[PDB]
Amino acid sequence: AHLTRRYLWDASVEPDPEKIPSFPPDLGFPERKERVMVATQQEMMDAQLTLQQRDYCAHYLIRLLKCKRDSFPNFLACKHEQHDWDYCEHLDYVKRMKEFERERRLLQRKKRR
Amino acid sequence: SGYTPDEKLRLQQLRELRRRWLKDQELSPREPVLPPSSLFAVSHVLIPMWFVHYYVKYHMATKPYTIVSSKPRIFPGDTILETGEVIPPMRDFP
Amino acid sequence: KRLFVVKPSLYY
Amino acid sequence: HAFFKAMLFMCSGSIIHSLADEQDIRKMGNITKIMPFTSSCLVIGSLALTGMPFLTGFYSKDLIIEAINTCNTNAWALLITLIATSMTAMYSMRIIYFVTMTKPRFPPLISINENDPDLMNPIKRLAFGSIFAGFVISYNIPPTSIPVLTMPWFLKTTALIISVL
Amino acid sequence: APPLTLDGIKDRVLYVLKLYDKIDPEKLSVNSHFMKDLGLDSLDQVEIIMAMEDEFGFEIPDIDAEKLMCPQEIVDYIADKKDVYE
Amino acid sequence: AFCAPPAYLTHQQKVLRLYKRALRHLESWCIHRDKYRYFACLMRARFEEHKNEKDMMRATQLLREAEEEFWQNQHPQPYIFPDSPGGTSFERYECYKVPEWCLDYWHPSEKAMYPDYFSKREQWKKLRMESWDREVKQLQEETSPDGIMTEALPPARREGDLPPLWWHIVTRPRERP
Amino acid sequence: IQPRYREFPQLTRSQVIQGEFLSSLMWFWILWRFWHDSDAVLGHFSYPDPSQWTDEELGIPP
Amino acid sequence: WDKDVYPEPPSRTPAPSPQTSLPNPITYLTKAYDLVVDWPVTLVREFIERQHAKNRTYYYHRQYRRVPDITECKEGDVLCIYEAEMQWRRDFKVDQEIMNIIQERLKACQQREGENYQQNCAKELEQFTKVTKAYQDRYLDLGAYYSARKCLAKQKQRMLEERKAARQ
Amino acid sequence: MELPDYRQWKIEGTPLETVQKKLAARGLRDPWARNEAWRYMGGFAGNITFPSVILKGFKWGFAAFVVALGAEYFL
Amino acid sequence: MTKDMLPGSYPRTPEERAAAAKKYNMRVEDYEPYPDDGMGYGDYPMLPNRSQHERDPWYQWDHSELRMNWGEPIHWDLDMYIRNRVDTSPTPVSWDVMCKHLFGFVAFMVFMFWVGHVFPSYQPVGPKQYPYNNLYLERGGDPTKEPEPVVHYD
Amino acid sequence: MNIFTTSILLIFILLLSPILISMSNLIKHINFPLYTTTSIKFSFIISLLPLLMFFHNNMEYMITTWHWVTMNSMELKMSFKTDFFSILFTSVALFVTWSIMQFSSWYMHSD
Amino acid sequence: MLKIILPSLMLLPLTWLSSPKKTWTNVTSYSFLISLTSLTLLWQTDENYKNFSNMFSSDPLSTPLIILTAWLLPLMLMASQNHLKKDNNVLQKLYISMLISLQILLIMTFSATELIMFYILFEATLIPTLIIITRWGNQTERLNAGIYFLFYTLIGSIPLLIALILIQNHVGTLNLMILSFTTHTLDASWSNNLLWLACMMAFLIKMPLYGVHLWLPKAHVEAPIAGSMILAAILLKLGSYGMIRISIILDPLTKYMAYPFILLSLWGMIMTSSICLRQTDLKSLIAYSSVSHMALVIASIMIQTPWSFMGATMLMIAHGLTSSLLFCLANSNYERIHSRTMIMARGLQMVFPLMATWWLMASLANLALPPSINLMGELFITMSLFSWSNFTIILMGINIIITGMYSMYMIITTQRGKLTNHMINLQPSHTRELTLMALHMIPLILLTTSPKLITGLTM
């Protein structure tokens, strides 16, 4: 895959995991809305979220924790909320994959003259 | 190969003696001549519990910082028992 | 049936 | 893994005791037919060790391998780890075969009794553990680490394919 | 486990020797010598000792094994090692 | 364990030992019983193929070649009988094989618990006391005139006499105490 | 209890039934969990294809 | 428990907020524990406290009047030097206990905050750092034979250094 | 103690018979086959298969699975 | 014990050698004194350097686990060579080949670990993005100072 | 909280009970293996409760029992850290030890 | 202190005026009661050290040693009760008098206020110990061992006398309080370096430094059990105590005059611990273990940090008790098999099951089992030396491994393994021996409960 391309064929086009992003955030985006978060820093703290957990799906995770606590003892009544939280994380992961792809195509473009 | 006559005789004699000793080892029917419900629950899970809870409550807790606990989780729409505050809600998402 | 098992003196 | 490793050890102890303190897997055979309870629990233990879907092992080892395959890692370390994951299946098969599938090899004077409750009940308890505790713990424990759930099909089912292979 | 007994050992050793083809089960008897009475070879005796070893789950050190040349001697060796007739 | 090793071994003993060792290693290699029989029969065929060789120099050369081949083909991890030296539970019960001379130190109150056994033991001690003198004289008189000696001991020749040096052979602890 | 020599021992029905019951429990659990949670095995969320994404999708300029 | 010397933020436990038909085992186990264990134990403790109310006795924290420091002692005057040295030792170990109290505060803060400790324990970390700097400047590098005179010499060395730095 | 009668043990129709055939084809015979015949016969007769050992109780587990699934759909 | 029965100095003449052999219960031809390097060995016999593991296991030795009979000459290094320590027993594989194999396996492992370090394996994804200035406040940052605005986008 | 800490300490007390009984003449008169198995069973049952509390409110405790010594500004207290790791592993270890302690009676009856 | 000294002196009249039958019982009992009386020195509820008169004083450093000395005498009498079984009454009473005199002198030494008290009462210990080794020892070389023990210490001590006289001439006194409260900095002149050596060498020899440790392996395998016990419980600590009391004046020279002896200690510890692996004499193995532990003590004392001093004191006490117990155990087996080889007797757990328990506990104390005060001491010394230089952890770790190794080697070689069935004479353990081991262990367990007692002056 991309690893094969980076290690065997050319590496100029292929990204580097550390470097991304390696281009201005506006090149090709005339308007680039900044990311939004639903939870406040205060709420994310009160829910005792760990630093790694304190991402952009914080609201979904907080909902999950609230409903787990509320459903105790029954621990199987949180499937919908957990699915939604993992779905939010999947969306974030796709956003990061799109960042990777962006950088790849931009480097291919830069390979000019 | 094979035992010599002396070896065969010796082994037979030692066999007889060995089996006599082994039979000697038997103990007679009188040989071990000995000379002349929740009870467990109450006396091992409750009696110790009284002492231990006495210690905890009336010594450990009474000392400072002995029993420290992490903050209980607080969520939106959650009501604090003591102050009565109601933590505010969450901005809706699309 | 039951055979004497020799043991080191434990009385002391 | 505490559960099914303890269970495997107990099953092996049952076998060793019932046979004349034999521990070689060359002089054990056809145990599945002669000691149904111990062999059944041993099979459960092996299938837990090589995490088959939804047993106790699977509710941990699979996620471990998932994170391994989808985290920045030493390439060689990843490769040998996967090979060793498959090779665990290989030696578990070694046991399940040479100790439970081939025609008997033990000494002729059979004297096999596992009907003792002090043996049956403990192994029963640990088998129920190996069958449920994984799911129970995994579903009850609070969130801690964000897991990576998006990945290619081959990465997603890599552990299962290598184990079965 | 079932404790061993002298007649039991005799029965089992006789069983194995009976199932050995080279020995005709008719002539076979407790006191019958191997190489002379039964007309066997030293290799055959080696295999006899190996078979009895397997039967009883214990090893005969070859110095002692070579000497046992009759079923009675094998029975007596097993008895002496395993302390049978209490 | 019940017979002293000879000064040396003859071709017969050496070859028989090799036969046994090679057969056991062949079994360890061939787990299944049918396969083991198949190959053990071939092994006996090979061993007997040179059974009658009256040129002992060639016989010894053949034996040396067989031994080197054995060392090349020996199973790295062979089969060991549980009680056999080097096998699990080789000495597992030596903790409880406490000797008989300890009973002499038992407190009389402990001996009271077992009255009859100690009476029989007293008989045995009396017998040993009686027999020591005769057995020592027996060995002294049966010593070979020449300076050639072997570990093997003599049997009881006279009547009503215990075999020489029998206390340690007899009375040894039971295998599984 | 009875020791048997060169023969298959009669199996007490207790161990038979209990072993079959534990094995059947394992298989029932696996099948039920597969039916109600086949995501854990067969996949969770459809992994997209980076190839198809358009230059408009990623905001590349020409 | 002097809350001042041992500060302890307030408790903020949330509402029961049940959303399950099933009964929470914890509430019933706690009720059983209360009634069975706490009640008799409290009876015993109350009896002991009444017995203590009878035969009450008092003990007083000792007060040590100040005495001249080693700075006020003429060289080789063992009589005064002994008193100055003992005073210094008592102050030394009182400082030790100060450090213990502040370290206990830091540990309790870490445990209380949990995963917010990287921000909410900043105040106590700052206090701990300042007090440990003070402790280092007071008693560190003093041999096992630490003494008021060594402390004075160390302080004067540091004061000479600071005076030089100020001049330059 | 009933030691079974030795005439009971024969090689015919047992896997070792093939070994005996392949041996006599080389001009060799084993004298011991009857000693180990007991293993390849009687209640020990029959060959186990890894799929069979794995699917120990699959039938009952599948029956219970069907019962549970029908119950869940009905409720 | 007396002088004649206790050890002594290096046997300097054949009659001394014979007397020493008789003292040690060893044959006059088997007895060999340690080399006269002046390291205290003196008269003590030089015995074969084979561990007690090699001794016959089935024999009824006088001193059992030691596997030595009464009166037998005792190696100068018996404590090292007891069954619980060094084992000079023959091995199924030659020591040289064993060393080669073990060290070669180690070399291959470390080399390939270096290969992996230089060429890691990673999934095709961008770095995880965190909010609030990479959580400046709750990742251990002073409130007064303002971190460089680190932004994220879509 | 009292119940949680009390249970944590009671687990260790229960586990020490067999030892103290062993150092007494009552060991001869009681069936010691069964007594120890029972103690382990009860200890596991006790441990279940703190596990439930943690699964509910996920509150972790630092419990300081005895002040062993003070070493010039370094107190050594007999501390306990009850949290996810400790609580769950105590439960699991007690379960597995209950099973193995019952199985030890069978495997070691003769010894 | 004179409520403890005078009863000790009066033990002697009791020993000599008692009837032959009741002499052992009377002296043992009254010695236990003197030990009890010695606990009064633990009522230090203030930081002001105790000074009972112009002559005698006590401190946090001296109280534990004095109490240990008092505790040892009853145990010494019990340990000696047997091998003196068939000696004439006057000879037995002579032995008891020697032990009583040793206790008196050692208590006075540890409670002395002036270093020329200390220099006299410290060397007066040579006479009783020399007599114990030479007169009642077994083998022939006890005379040579006595000569070594006497003269190593005397050669060390004479320079100490010269240095002390110079100190008194220069200062005007030798009261340790006055020296402490009027000390002044030494200058790095060659004469001052020579002094430093003169003051330190006698104590370093008594704390056998690696190069001058040849008199312990001899004195111990030639001395009777009581001699070994008192020696490597108290006499060895005389050197450490002297070093601790006297180093106050000898500053700042120590910073660079300690490199040689720190290095010798940190290397000889490894060398001796290794020697313990391949030694065929149980008494010698214990002696070399003691040498390694005293190597640690010397390193810590010569680095002088608070941790160093406190851990050194703790380990001093812990080693006292543990080595004493080990020697009593080895003497227990010696009284039966009449040999000192470790290989000879094996598997004795099959005949002395409880004494095997005591052996195990002693080996654990030796190998440093947490939370035992033995470990605590070694751990704190390790922390000190690591602070001094972070590379010492290598030597410390190698020594820890080897320490565990010989400690378990003793147990496996002796207690475990096939019983040497040919030993008919092995007799059931005497209640005397068992009580002796219990009296050694129980104080260790109680102090592990209450370490605050045995910390040094610093902490």
Beta bridge partners of D110: G4
Q: What is the DSSP string of F28-57?
A: HH--SHHHHHHHHHHHHHHHHHTS----HH
For residue I69, the chain G residues in CB contact (below 8 A) are 32, 35
Q: Given a contact as 3+ CB pairs under 8 Å, which chains touch I?
A: D, E, F, G
C-alpha to C-alpha distance for D44 and D55, rounded to whole angstroms:
9
Whole-number Å distance between alpha carbons of H9 and B83: 14
* Parent domain of E37: 1-86
Helix (H, G, I), strand (E, B) or coil at J134: helix
Residues whose CB falls within 8 Å of the CB of residue J9, separated by 6 or more in sequence, listed in order: J42, J43
User: CB–CB of L4/L36 below 8 Å?
Assistant: no
Measured between alpha carbons, how far is L391 from L127 in angstroms, rounded to an integer?
43
Count of Cβ atoms closer than 10 Å to residue H68 Cβ? 12
Alpha-carbon Rg for chain G, nearest whole angstrom, is 28
Contact F97, C5 (CB under 8 A): no
Among D22, E47, E16, E43, which residue's Cα sits nearest to residue F27? Answer: E47
CA H58 to chain centre: 24
Beta sheet of K75-82, edge-to-edge order: B67-69, K61-70, K75-82
**Cα F155 from Cα F137, distance rounded (Å):** 13
Distance from C-alpha of F117 to C-alpha of F106, rounded to nearest angstrom: 13
In one-letter notation, the amino acid at residue D25 is: I
Instruction: Report how far Cα L420 is from the mean position of its chain's Cα atoms.
Output: 33
Sign of CA dihedral L267, L273, L275, L278: negative
For residue H16, the chain A residue with the least C-alpha distance is: A70
Distance from C-alpha of D105 to C-alpha of I36, rounded to nearest angstrom: 9
Count of other CB atoms within 10 angstroms of residue L55: 14
* Rounded Cα–Cα distance for residues L137 and L149 (Å): 14
According to DSSP, residue E25 is labeled: T
Chain I residues interacting with chain E (CB cutoff of 8 angstroms): 1, 3, 6, 9, 29-32, 34-35
Partners of J121 in the beta sheet?
Answer: D73
User: Tokens 């120590």 identify what position?
Assistant: L254
G5 DSSP assignment = E
Q: What is the H or E stretch that residue B11 is in?
A: helix B5-24
| Cβ contact G25:D131 at 8 Å | yes
User: For the range J55-59, what are the long-range contacts, defined as Cβ-Cβ under 8 Å and sequence gap of 24 or more?
Assistant: J56/F5, J57/F85, J57/F86, J58/E61, J58/E63, J58/F1, J58/F85, J59/F1, J59/F4, J59/F5
> Is the CB of residue D41 less than 8 Å away from at least one CB of chain I?
no
Is J139 touching A (CB cutoff 8 A)?
yes
- Dihedral, CA of residue D58, residue D59, residue D64 and residue D65, to nearest 10: 30
Distance CA L322, CA L448 (A): 13
Burial of I49 (0-12, 13-18, 19+ CB in 10 A): exposed
Taking an 8 Å cut-off on Cβ atoms, the answer to whether L251 and H143 are in contact is yes
Task: Give the CB-side neighbour count of residue F151, counting CA atoms within 13 A.
Answer: 12
In 3-state terms chain H splits into helix, strand, coil percentages (rounded to 5) of 65, 0, 35
| Strand-pair partners of K67 | K77
Cα–Cα distances in angstroms (integers) from residue D139 to residues A47, D133, L450, in the given order = 19, 10, 46
Cis peptide before A21, with omega less than 30 degrees from 0? Answer: yes
Element (H, E) at K41: helix K32-57
Of B63, B39, B41, B43, residue with least CA distance to B51: B43
Q: What is the resolution of this structure in A?
A: 3.9
Which D residues 82-141 touch I at CB under 8 Å? 93, 96-97, 100-105, 108
Judged by DSSP in three states, G4 sits in strand
Amino acid occupying residue D158: T
Q: Distance of CA E43 to CAs B1, F10, F16, L346, Å?
A: 12, 15, 7, 43
Per the CB < 8 A criterion, the answer to whether H57 and K84 are in contact is no
Q: Residue K107 in contact with residue D123, Cβ under 8 Å? A: no
Among chain F residues, the shortest Cα distance to D107 is held by F81
Cα–Cα dist L72/L225, whole Å: 12
Q: Kindly give, in sequence order, each residue whose CB lies less than 8 Å from that of residue J5, ignoring residues fewer than 6 positions away.
A: J23
**Number of domains forming the structure of chain E:** 1
The two structure tokens encoding residue L18:
């008692």
Chain F, nearest residue to J65 by Cα? F91
Q: Do J57 and F85 touch (CB under 8 A)?
A: yes
Q: 3-class DSSP state for residue H103?
A: helix
Q: Which residues pair with K70 in a beta bridge?
A: K75
Which residue matches tokens 């903790």? Answer: F95
Nearest partner of K70 among L450, L442, H143, H63, judged by Cα: L450
Contacts of D121 in chain K (CB under 8 A): 102
Q: Can you tell me the distance from the alpha carbon of D69 to that of D61, in angstroms, rounded to the nearest whole number? A: 12
3-class secondary structure, J62: coil
- Among F175, F125, F130, F93, CA closest to B24: F125
Residue J109 region by backbone torsions, left for phi larger than 0, else alpha for psi between -120 and 50, else beta: alpha
Helices and strands in chain K: count of H runs, count of E runs: 4, 2
Q: Give the C-alpha separation, B53 to K9, whole Å.
A: 9
Chains E vs F: touching, with 3+ CB pairs under 8 Å?
A: yes
The answer to whether residues A94 and J129 touch, using CB atoms and an 8 Å cutoff, is no
The two tokens of residue E81 are 């090692």
Buried residues in G3-34 as b, exposed as e (16+ CB within 10 A): ebbbbbbebeeebeebbbebbbbbbbbbbbbe
Q: Which residue has the tokens 């039916």?
A: G35
Q: Which residues contact A106 (CB under 8 A, 6 or more apart)?
A: A22, A23, A27, A28, G60
Identify the chains in contact with C, defined as 3+ C-beta pairs within 8 A.
B, F, L
Instruction: Specify the experimental method.
Output: cryo-EM
Candidates L173, L181, L240, partner chain H, best to mutate (most H CBs within 10 A)? L181
| L178-184 own/partner pairs: CB under 8 Å, 24+ apart | L178/H78, L179/L248, L179/L249, L180/H145, L180/H147, L180/L248, L181/H78, L181/H81, L181/H82, L181/H85, L182/H76, L182/H78, L182/H81, L183/L248, L183/L249, L183/L251
The Cα F24–Cα F31 span in angstroms is 11
User: Token digits for G2?
Assistant: 């009875």
Q: Which 3 state secondary structure label does DSSP give B87?
A: coil
The domain spans of chain L are 2-459
Contact C12 L350 (CB under 8 A): no
DSSP string, K64-85: EEEEEEE-SS-EEEEEEEESHH
Q: What share of chain C is helix, strand, coil (3-state, %, to 5)?
A: 0, 10, 90
Distance from C-alpha of L49 to C-alpha of L51, rounded to nearest angstrom? 7
Count the neighbouring beta carbons within 10 Å of the beta carbon of residue L450: 11
Is D108 within 8 Å of E1 when comparing Cβ atoms? Answer: no
Give the CA distances from residue B32 to residues C4, C11, F112, in Å, rounded to whole numbers and listed in that order. Answer: 10, 16, 9
Q: Which among G48, G53, G61 has CB closest to A28?
A: G61
Query: What distances in angstroms separate CA J100 from CA D89, J89, J93, J96, one per listed residue?
Result: 30, 19, 11, 6
Tokens 């020493």 correspond to J20
Distance from CA of B20 to the nearest CA of F (A): 10
Number of C-beta neighbours around residue G40 at 10 A: 18
- When CB atoms are compared, the residue of B6, B14, B35 closest to F154 is B6
Backbone angles phi, psi at H9, to 5 degrees: -50, 165
CB atoms within 10 A of CB D5: 16
Mark out the alpha helices in chain E (DSSP H runs).
6-19, 42-56, 62-67, 71-82
Q: What pairs with residue B79 in β-bridges? A: B86
Q: Please name the member of F3, F44, F84 whose beta carbon is closest to the beta carbon of E67.
A: F3
Exposed, middle or buried: residue B10 (CB in 10 Å: 0-12, 13-18, 19+)? buried
Contact (Cβ atoms closer than 8 angstroms) between residue D3 and residue K96:
yes
User: In angstroms, rounded to a whole number, what is the distance separating the alpha carbons of residues J134 and J147?
Assistant: 9
SS (H, E, C) chain L: CHHHHHHHHHHHHHHHHCCCCCHHHHHHHHHHHHHHHHHHHHCCCCCCCCCCCCCECCCCCHHHHHHHHHHHHHHHHHHHHHHCCCCCHHHHHHHHHHHHHHHHHHHHHHCECEHHHHHHHHHCCHHHHHHHHHHHCCCCCHHHHHHHHHHHHHHHHHHHHHHHHHHHHHHCCCEHHHHHHHCCCCCCCHHHHHHHHHHHHHHHHHCCCHHHCCHHHHHHHHCCHHHHHHHHHHHHHHHHHHHHHHCCCCCCCHHHHCHHHHHHHHHHHHHHHHHHHCCCEHHHHHHHHHHHHHHHHHHHHHHCCHHHHHHHHHHHHHHHHHHHHHHHHHHHHHHHHCCCECCCCCCHHHCCHHHHHHHHHHHHHHHCCCCCHHHHHHHHHHHHHHHHCCCHHHHHHHHHHHHHHHHHHHHHHHCCCCCCCCCCCCCCCCHHHHHHHHHHHHHHHHHHHCHHHHCCCCC
Q: What token pair was written down for L159? A: 């320079």
Residue L59 burial class via C-beta count within 10 angstroms: exposed 0-12, middle 13-18, buried 19 and up:
buried
Please, which residues have CB within 8 angstroms of residue H126's CB and are 6 or more apart in sequence? none
Residue E35: helix, strand or coil by DSSP?
A: coil
User: Residue D122 and residue F119: Cα distance in Å, rounded?
Assistant: 47
Neighbours of H29 (CB within 10 A): 16
**Residue A34, SS3 per DSSP:** strand
8 A C-beta contact, residue J8 and residue J22: no
CA–chain centroid gap for L378, Å, is: 16
Let me know: does B49 contact K6? Beta carbons within 8 Å: yes
The number of C-alpha atoms within 13 Å of L216 and in the hemisphere containing its C-beta is 28
**What is the distance between the alpha carbons of residues L421 and L426, in angstroms, rounded to a whole number?**
10
Please answer whether residues D50 and D94 qualify as being in contact, where contact means their C-beta atoms are separated by less than 8 angstroms.
no
Optimal mutation site among E21, E22, E35, E83, interface F, most CBs of chain F within 10 A: E83
L vs K contact (3+ beta-carbon pairs below 8 A): yes
CA distance L444 to L366: 12
Which residues pair with residue K63 across a beta bridge? B67, K80
For L121-160, letters b (16+ CB in 10 Å) and e give: bbbbbbebbbbbbbebbeeeebeebbebbbebbeebbebb
Q: Using alpha carbons, select from D35, D32, D33 the residue that is nearest to residue D14.
A: D35
Chain length of chain F: 177
- Rounded CA separation K9/K15 (Å): 10
Contact criterion met (CB below 8 Å) for A78 and A67: yes
L373 Cβ neighbours under 8 A, 6+ residues apart = L314, L315, L317, L318, L444, L447, L448, L451, L454
The answer to whether residues G58 and A94 touch, using CB atoms and an 8 Å cutoff, is: no
Helix, strand and coil in chain B, % to nearest 5: 45, 5, 50
Task: Say whether residue K69 is in contact with chain L using an 8 A CB cutoff.
Answer: yes
Q: Quick one: tokens of D97? A: 């075969």
Three-state DSSP string of chain D: CHHHHHHHHHHHHHHHHHCCCCCCCCCCCCHHHHCHHHHHHHHHHHHHHCCCCCCCCHHHHHHHHHHHHCCCECHHHHHHHHHHHHHHHHHHHHHHHHCCCCCCCCCCEECCCCCCHHHHHHHHHHHHHHHHHHHHHHHHCCCCCCCCCCCCHHHHCHHHHHHHC
- Pull the structure tokens for residue L423: 């030993």
Beta bridge partners of A34: J153
Does E41 qualify as catalytic in the annotation? yes
DSSP A37-74: -SS-HHHHHHTT--TTT-STTHHHHHHHHHHHHHH-S-
- Assigned token pair, L39: 């606990």
Find tokens 């010499």 and name the residue.
Answer: H153
Residue J31: count of CB within 10 angstroms of its CB: 21
Task: Tell me the C-alpha distance between J74 and J26, whole Å.
Answer: 11
Does the CB of K52 have a partner CB in chain H at under 8 Å?
A: yes
- Sign of the Cα torsion F44, F48, F49, F53 reads positive
Instruction: Provide the number of CB pairs (under 8 Å) joining chain A to chain K.
Output: 7
Instruction: Measure Cα distances from L25 to A27, L79, L136, L325 in Å.
Output: 102, 13, 21, 22
Residue in E41, E54, E62, E80 annotated catalytic: E41
Place of tokens 């004392």: L301
